[PDB]
Ligand binder design. Structure first.
Ligand SMILES: *[C@@H]1O[C@H](CO)[C@@H](O[C@@H]2O[C@H](CO)[C@@H](O[C@@H]3O[C@H](CO[C@H]4O[C@H](CO[C@H]5O[C@H](CO)[C@@H](O)[C@H](O)[C@@H]5O[C@H]5O[C@H](CO)[C@@H](O)[C@H](O)[C@@H]5O)[C@@H](O)[C@H](O)[C@@H]4O)[C@@H](O)[C@H](O[C@H]4O[C@H](CO)[C@@H](O)[C@H](O)[C@@H]4O[C@H]4O[C@H](CO)[C@@H](O)[C@H](O)[C@@H]4O[C@H]4O[C@H](CO)[C@@H](O)[C@H](O)[C@@H]4O)[C@@H]3O)[C@H](O)[C@H]2NC(C)=O)[C@H](O)[C@H]1NC(C)=O
Ligand SMILES: *[C@@H]1O[C@H](CO)[C@@H](O[C@@H]2O[C@H](CO)[C@@H](O[C@@H]3O[C@H](CO)[C@@H](O)[C@H](O[C@H]4O[C@H](CO)[C@@H](O)[C@H](O)[C@@H]4O)[C@@H]3O)[C@H](O)[C@H]2NC(C)=O)[C@H](O)[C@H]1NC(C)=O
Ligand SMILES: *[C@@H]1O[C@H](CO)[C@@H](O[C@@H]2O[C@H](CO)[C@@H](O[C@@H]3O[C@H](CO)[C@@H](O)[C@H](O)[C@@H]3O)[C@H](O)[C@H]2NC(C)=O)[C@H](O)[C@H]1NC(C)=O
Lengths: 110, 52, 51, 126
């Protein structure tokens, strides 16, 4: 199990509901509500979209949102745009004072 | 082990020969101890030999 | 609070009894401490000064 | 604003070791954790280890237990990661990050608040 589990790729037209979920063990997302999501376009940074499960840092549009349910944390989606066509990675708290990342994603807005 | 600048609150990592359950046999084992419970052993100068 | 994520280490010492000790410290090393609200302490010491 | 401008890309062949340096500006260096993450060419993303730039204490992914050792020079404002025992699987676009603020009273090291990043280097183990 390479790091956290994630879908390989997800998609959906504007107006459609989406969730790009990320799942870990009891030594993982369950405990501390420590999960975050990234926005990587090609040849750029993994732009910083969500952290502390639900919060969005400054510079983020408040369409983006997140959530936790026990062993998984779901990226919550609204109002798709051509900018949302992007990777959606996942990194969280891993035990023994580490983090553990996710397999990634590619969105294709339809 | 040592750290400089700022501040450091470290404790010592001290090894000691232990008598295992076989009285003939001994093995090297270690434990971490806070400084107040650890005192240098020899009245002569030695930077590594300590006592409880 | 003691923030350090200490570990339990056990050592057999003589026939059938175990000595315990700390193993590696997990995570980053930090300082133990205790907190008090400032204005409540000022109020306590002022009311004690009144007496 | 804030940047953690890394070095340029440099590569050796499998079995050797390589280097990447991670600068910082303008914010102070000794005040936030420095994190190293790896994004392999046909994979998701990985984590190398966290650097405490003040005391030098570090922890690293158990995959890289002996293969990686992190260091820093606070006066310059730069941090170093050196990966040994290389393979082609150790190709990636390597990134360097400021993690969370450092308090003396609690452990914020493992918080994945990968706020600001380095500008990236293409280390194909060639
Ligand atoms: C017992 O009692 C003790 C205390 O008595 C108690 O300990 C306290 O616990 C608190 C709870 O955790 C803790 O609070 C945190 O404090 C963090 C630090 O905030 C202070 O410091 C910064 C310093 O800023 C630097 O750098 C900036 C540039 O970035 C610069 O502008 C500044 O001038 C300064 O510069 C440095 O470099 C200069 C170079 O020249 C130099 O000149 C300067 O001198 C300096 O060296 C200030 O900016 C702050 O305003 C504060 O003064 C604080 O960051 C932290 O909040 C973050 O984390 C929280 C969770 O821990 C989140 O909930 C929160 O949202 C924050 O998250 C943001 O920040 C993190 C970094 O940690 C980042 O990774 C995130 O992505 C996120 O980013 C978003 O917000 C930031 C703004 O922060 C935006 O900029 C971004 O764009 C994003 O939008 C906590 O608030 C407190 O510090 C601690 N007390 C002490 C003394 O340590 C203890 O817990 C008690 N015991 C018990 C048991 O309870
Ligand atoms: C504080 O210290 C404690 C230890 O005193 C520490 O908790 C430990 O965390 C490790 C993880 O780093 C736990 O190890 C697990 O062991 C089980 C075997 O029972 C494995 O199944 C686990 O691995 C699975 O999950 C991984 C993802 O996390 C997968 O990648 C992997 O493929 C496996 O499927 C894992 O190795 C260990 O059990 C705990 N021990 C205790 C006593 O809690 C804790 O993390 C430290 N930090 C904090 C903030 O508490
Ligand atoms: C406290 O001190 C003891 C020793 O005095 C430390 O234990 C030693 O840790 C090292 C590093 O892990 C061990 O050596 C390594 O072993 C592996 C084998 O997998 C090898 O591949 C490495 O090259 C290296 O040699 C060593 O065996 C171990 N010693 C004992 C007796 O267990 C301990 O880590 C110290 N702890 C702290 C917190 O300082």
């Amino acid at each position: 199990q390479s790091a956290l589990t994630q879908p390989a790729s997800v998609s959906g037209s504007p107006g459609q509901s989406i969730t790009i979920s990320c799942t870990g063990t009891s030594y993982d997302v369950a405990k501390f509500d420590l999960v975050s999501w990234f926005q990587q376009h090609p040849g750029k940074a993994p732009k910083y979209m969500i952290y502390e499960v639900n919060k969005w840092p400054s510079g983020v549009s408040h369409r983006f949102s997140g959530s936790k349910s026990g062993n998984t944390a779901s990226l919550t989606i609204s109002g798709l745009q051509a900018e949302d066509e992007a990777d959606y990675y996942c990194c969280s708290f891993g035990g023994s004072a580490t983090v553990v990342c996710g397999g990634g994603t590619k969105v294709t807005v339809l | 082990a040592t750290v400089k600048n700022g501040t450091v609150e470290e404790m010592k990592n001290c090894s000691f020969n232990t008598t295992t359950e076989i009285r003939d046999k001994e093995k090297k084992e270690y434990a971490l101890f806070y400084k107040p419970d650890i005192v240098p052993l020899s009245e002569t100068n030695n930077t590594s030999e300590y006592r409880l | 609070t003691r923030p350090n994520n200490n570990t339990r280490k056990s050592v057999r010492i003589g026939p059938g009894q175990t000595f315990y000790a700390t193993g590696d410290i997990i995570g980053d090393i930090k300082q133990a401490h205790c907190n008090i609200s400032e204005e409540k302490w000022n109020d306590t010491l002022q009311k004690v000064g009144i007496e | 604003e804030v940047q953690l401008v890394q070095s340029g890309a440099e590569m050796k062949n499998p079995g050797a070791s390589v280097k990447v340096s991670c600068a910082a500006s303008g914010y102070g260096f000794t005040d936030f954790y420095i994190h190293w993450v790896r994004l392999a060419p046909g994979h998701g993303l990985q984590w190398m280890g966290w650097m405490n730039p003040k005391t030098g204490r570090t922890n690293n992914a158990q995959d890289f237990q002996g293969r990686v050792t992190l260091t820093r020079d606070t006066s310059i404002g730069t941090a170093y990661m050196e990966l040994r025992r290389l393979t082609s699987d150790d190709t990636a676009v390597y990134y360097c990050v400021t993690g969370g603020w450092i308090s003396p009273y609690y452990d914020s090291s493992y918080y994945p608040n990968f706020d600001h990043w380095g500008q990236g280097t293409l280390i194909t183990v060639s």
